[PDB]
Amino acid sequence: EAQVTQNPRYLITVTGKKLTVTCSQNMNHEYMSWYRQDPGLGLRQIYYSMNVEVTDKGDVPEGYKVSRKEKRNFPLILESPSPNQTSLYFCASSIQQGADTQYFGPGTRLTVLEDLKNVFPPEVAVFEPSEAEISHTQKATLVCLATGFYPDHVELSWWVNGKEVHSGVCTDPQPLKEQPALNDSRYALSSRLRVSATFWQNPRNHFRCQVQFYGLSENDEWTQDRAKPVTQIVSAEAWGRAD
Amino acid sequence: EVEQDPGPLSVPEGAIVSLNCTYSNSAFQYFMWYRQYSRKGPELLMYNKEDGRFTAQVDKSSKYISLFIRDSQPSDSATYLCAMSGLKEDSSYKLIFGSGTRLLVRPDIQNPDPAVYQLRDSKSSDKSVCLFTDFDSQTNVSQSKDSDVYITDKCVLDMRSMDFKSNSAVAWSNKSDFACANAFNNSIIPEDTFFPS
């Protein structure tokens, strides 16, 4: 038991500008592999490496190269990213090429755009529980909405009195498009947190819907009027109410 | 090459589910199942015969692989991927994955109390949302197909320490004519759905 890490986990790039994604594992495994996953196609292998200084094309290598100078690392290199390389990439490692467990990294979501003009961070709002729900059910549901973001590179979480909560939460599995009539529609995503009425009723309890957005980096050039859409957290909050 | 049905397969909690794949290569001799939640990394489930609620089986003559999940739970909801390869005695034996089947296990809602509630923004704005909640898992939430109204699909939350699960969907819009009364007019919702005043 250890693990496979990939860096970065999220990345936006313009078409044609070279990037590399690292994959690293500390288990001294000889075999490492890169796949992409796309709707309808499942995992497709891009390239694999049976050991140090051994690499081999997989089923969909075009547009990718790799290297294997050491056992620990197996980077994926895209010399000239194209839009159809927009995808979710998984690195995996195993003691040997098959007939053995493969351990997968957490995934790297890469979006390759014609330019970066349509990148925007979310705005976040918390909607407080209905007094009608409280009286009908003795429970209280808060709703969080993250709106206006693009691309769909977000992680939403809830924090109650400064600690993350998972019980009584459910977040949409995918966002929806806010302006699906326009190109590169910004997206929206909703989540619910439900607590007991007693808990919502206490004005000392503090509830925060936190959205981590992964956007442009320090180095990315930005020339639009508005603030650069860098990686950032955007939150909204509510306090309990006796009401 | 591996053929696997994408689903989604929807079943009620407590049902037995069967997931399967078919393959064409007779050298395949190792067979495992991987389970992938949301967009997270696949993780080995079975490579065995039985393991509690799980039984993996293979018929090499039929080239047909199956995973059975007894007493299925909403927590089983995931994509299941069959993986397979030749022996290590083989010249090449690269593991390959089928393209996965998505399974949804529908929560058993013991005491439905379907209602549509209006929630207001904490910050103020005149902004609100409409929350349809507490309906049974038979209920489908439709996308209204109006470009200026947004409706999420149903999502199940679990209040572990109350032994309580509930479904909900959210709708919101800026259209001046939007109201919780009409928000889910495009869906078929229980006649007893509560619309507070």
Numbering used by the authors:
A (entry chain B): 1 to 243
B (entry chain A): 3 to 49, 55 to 204
Q: What did the publication describing this PDB structure actually write?
A:
To assess ligand-induced conformational changes in the TCRs, we determined the structures of 12-6 and 1a2 in unbound form to 2.36 and 1.83 Å resolution, respectively (TCR 38-10 did not crystallize). CDR3β underwent a rearrangement (r.m.s.d. in α-carbon positions of 1.8 Å for residues 96–102) that resulted in formation of four hydrogen bonds and 33 van der Waals contacts with P7 Arg and P8 His at the critical C-terminus of p53R175H. This rearrangement allowed CDR3α to form a β-hairpin whose tip engages the HLA-A2 α1 helix and p53R175H, thereby optimizing TCR interactions with both MHC and peptide.
The structures reveal how oligoclonal TCRs 12-6, 38-10, and 1a2 discriminate between wild-type and mutated p53, and demonstrate that there are multiple distinct solutions to recognizing the p53R175H neoepitope with sufficient affinity to mediate tumor cell killing.
